[PDB]
Amino acid sequence: TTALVCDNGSGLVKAGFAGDDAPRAVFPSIVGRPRHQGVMVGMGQKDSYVGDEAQSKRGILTLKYPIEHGIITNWDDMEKIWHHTFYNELRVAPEEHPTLLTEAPLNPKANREKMTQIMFETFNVPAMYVAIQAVLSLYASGRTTGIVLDSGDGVTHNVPIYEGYALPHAIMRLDLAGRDLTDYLMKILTERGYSFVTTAEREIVRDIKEKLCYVALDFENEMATAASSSSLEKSYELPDGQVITIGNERFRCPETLFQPSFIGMESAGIHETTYNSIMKCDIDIRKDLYANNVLSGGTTMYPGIADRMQKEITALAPSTMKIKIIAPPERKYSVWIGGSILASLSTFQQMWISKQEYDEAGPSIVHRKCF
């Protein structure tokens, strides 16, 4: 039979059968209970709208993501999300399909063990396998080397790989991602008068960020230009009218990636954690990693980031090496495409964690040889 390539993510759940080009169903991972009282009788009001249904009734819900930073903080809601994904968005019972979840690097063990225990006890799948979210993104590019920066919505991690041999001592995981950029944008919009507070209006700020923000090639020059002319002010129409005008908030929101001091984080930007991740590698594979830097994940879709990052790394790196940044147009679904490719391989067909194996060793089987 065919395998189910699910990809929990944090912000958008992407799923679909193995062997295709794009995920079959992509929908936000939010579960929102209603918060008001409700007076109409017999309206058929449910107790929790999940997935894309709660992005249409969000006016009277309190949306809450079940995955904070890679890790899962609310297991009941995550189980509800998985149940919805299997039964309503794909309509395939899990009793007859292997599953291939994905997990960020350096995550707590208990999260992974609970994930496999749920998949084997509640949904009762035949066999499931958990894979690191960066190796798949490297599969999708058709490479076999390269250092991949997978800046998702929950957590940004940077896994270097050479000739198929991952370097476990050079993984640099940073917890700045799309959600913190949404919060920072929502916080700097208040400098013009627009106040978004409700958890429903966070979605509106996210839409503003997606449609308007861009990464500046040079920050100081843009700050000077936006403060003199008015060629940058782009307007946007809220879900009820009252258009708003975003000035130099456009390139200040995604600039947080390269200067995490804006949101008070100490660490260095995504332009310098990649160079540090490279320098921890051996001295003889640094040229190949320099030449095959891969971008993935949703948050790396800002217009103009593949040039800013290349300029920064070229500034840091030695002058002789060639710096090349692979930015495929299908960046958002790169991890899932790689997952489909991996699940479609014949050599991989014996790596699944078969159910009888789980019955013999318990949920701690995932840390064992079947990784």
Ligand X SMILES: Nc1ncnc2c1ncn2[C@@H]1O[C@H](COP(=O)(O)OP(=O)(O)O)[C@@H](O)[C@H]1O
Binding residues for ADP: 10, 14, 153, 209, 298, 301, 332
Is 57 one of the binding residues for a second copy (CB under 8 A)? yes
Q: Which residues within the stretch 298-317 sit at the binding site for a second copy (CB under 8 A)? A: 317
Sequence-distant (6+) residues with CB within 8 A of 292 are 143, 145, 146, 147, 324, 326
- Judged by CB under 8 A, the chain residues 279 through 308 that form the site for another protein are 303
In sequence order, the 6+-apart residues with CB closer than 8 A to the CB of 113 are 363, 364, 366, 367
**From 185-193, 205-213, 315-323, 327-335, span contacting Mg ion (CB under 5 A):** 327-335
Q: Is 265 or 326 the residue whose CB approaches another protein more closely? A: 326
Reported as type and span, the H/E element at residue 136 is helix 133-140
Binding residues: 10, 14, 153, 209, 298, 301, 332
> If binding is defined by CB under 8 A, does position 162 make contact with a second copy?
yes
Binding site partner of 301, from another protein, ligand X, a second copy, none, Cβ cut-off 5-8 A by kind: ligand X
Q: Does 354 bind a second copy (CB under 8 A)?
A: no
C-alpha to C-alpha distance for 268 and 191, rounded to whole angstroms: 26
Q: Which of 198, 226, 201, 228 is nearest to 214 (CA)?
A: 226
Residue 324 binding another protein, by CB under 8 A? yes
With CB under 8 A as the contact rule, the residue among 211, 280, 367, 368 that binds another protein is 211
Task: Tell me which of Mg ion, another protein, a second copy, none is bound by residue 152, counting a contact when its beta carbon lies within the kind-specific cut-off of 5 to 8 angstroms.
Answer: Mg ion
Q: Which does 53 bind (CB under 5 to 8 A by kind): another protein, Mg ion, a second copy, none?
A: none
Contact positions with Mg ion (CB under 5 A) in 145-204: 152
Distances (CA, A) of 36 to 29, 39, 42, 56: 22, 9, 16, 16
Q: Is the dihedral of CA 294, 299, 305, 309 positive or negative?
A: negative
369 binds a second copy (CB under 8 A): no
Q: Nearest CA to 13 among 1, 26, 24, 22?
A: 26
Taking CB under 8 A as the rule, does residue 367 contact another protein? no
| DSSP-assigned states of every residue in 90-117 | I---GGG--EEEEE-TT--HHHHHHHHH
Which residues contact another protein (rule: CB under 8 A)?
211, 303, 322, 324
